[PDB]
Amino acid sequence: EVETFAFQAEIAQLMSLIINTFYSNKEIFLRELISNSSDALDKIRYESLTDPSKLDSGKELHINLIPNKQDRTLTIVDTGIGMTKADLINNLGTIAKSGTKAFMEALQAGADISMIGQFGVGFYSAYLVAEKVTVITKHNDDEQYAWESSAGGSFTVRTDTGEPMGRGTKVILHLKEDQTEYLEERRIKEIVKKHSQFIGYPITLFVEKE
């Protein structure tokens, strides 16, 4: 049962800008996604101090980076707070509308795409390198969902029947053909060291088997 939704026009416009603008410094996507994971980990950690049972779905707070050359995917996994169905369809986008407007205006005033994170829409920097983004996510007291979009104005949400996560989020980047450098160990290591070296959770970079 797959549901298809239209992005708000402003968000579709942002995604088109990210896809169409000539901008070579694409590597900043990884910092943005790791930052998002860190924020989600911060949130479940904070909530767990007044309700310890929120960690019944898993106590370990960390981030995995998993490249797969066969699937041409880079996956960012965290055991953070996860996202609800309401998040995925309505609430994140409602928040994102104002950040998008502010970001657009900042760009026209001379800012560049690397500053996208300040506006709360850094998630969409994924489309610098991914033709399709699949997000598997599990929040306490909600089901496991798969969100997906190849841009073009729409996204899908379905209940996920894949491998159950206890809690957290997997952002699966289906990389563009010319962006496979982000599957290479030395490249990912370089980027993490450059932009994410003080993140307060373990970041495990998996090695490709093949």
- Which residue numbers belong to the known binding site for ATP? 36, 78, 97, 123
**Nearest distance from residue 38's CB to ligand KFY, in Å?**
9
Within a 13 Å sphere around the CA of 124, how many CA atoms are in the beta-carbon half? 28
Q: Pick the closer one to ligand KFY by CB: 59 or 69.
A: 59
What are the CA-CA distances from residue 74 to residues 3, 139, 171, 190, 209 (Å)? 25, 22, 8, 15, 14
Q: Pick the closer one to ligand KFY by CB: 121 or 129.
A: 121
Contacts with ligand KFY, residue ranges (CB under 6 A): 36-37, 40, 78, 80-83, 88, 92-93, 96, 120-121, 123, 135, 147, 169
- 157 C-beta neighbours (distance < 10 Å), count: 19
**Nearest distance from residue 120's CB to ligand KFY, in Å?**
5
**Nearest distance from residue 161's CB to ligand KFY, in Å?**
18
Q: Pick the closer one to ligand KFY by CB: 92 or 104.
A: 92
Whether the CB-CB separation of 175 and 72 falls below 8 Å is answered with: yes
